[PDB]
Amino acid sequence: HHHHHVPAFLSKLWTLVEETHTNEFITWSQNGQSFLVLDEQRFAKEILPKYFKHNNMASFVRQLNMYGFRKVVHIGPVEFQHPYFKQGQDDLLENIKRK
Numbered sequence: 001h002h003h004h005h006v007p008a009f010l011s012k013l014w015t016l017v018e019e020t021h022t023n024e025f026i027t028w029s030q031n032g033q034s035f036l037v038l039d040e041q042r043f044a045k046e047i048l049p050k051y052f053k054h055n056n057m058a059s060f061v062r063q064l065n066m067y068g069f070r071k072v073v074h075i076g077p078v079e080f081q082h083p084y085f086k087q088g089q090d091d092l093l094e095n096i097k098r099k
């Protein structure tokens with residue numbers, strides 16, 4: 001029920017990150033506070049078509065930016081975070097707003 005009013009993109013993303021089957025491509029990271037895409041190219045070819053019906057990483061990242069996700073960088077893989085996108089906490093998803 002936490003997903004009714006959540007944009008379909010975000011609901012689908014959260015479920016994708018949660019799904020254990022897809023951890024080889026995309027996983028929770030930083031104690032569930034961020035998520036990690038292990039290889040942009042592999043992810044865009046093998047995950048984006050099934051889950052989002054396209055194969056374009058820059059368009060997926062543009063949607064992340066639209067909802068206020070940011071990149072996590074060390075002081076290829078890419079890591080993103082949003083304060084209301086967290087492991088086992090889909091009750092927070094309704095807080096995520098568009099630009």
Ligand SMILES: [K+]
Nearest residue numbers: 017019022023
């Ligand atoms: K996953």
Ligand code: NA
Nearest residue numbers: 065068069070
């Ligand atoms: Na951003």
Ligand code: NA
Nearest residue numbers: 033034081082
């Ligand atoms: Na996050």
Ligand code: NA
Nearest residue numbers: 084085086089
């Ligand atoms: Na969440």
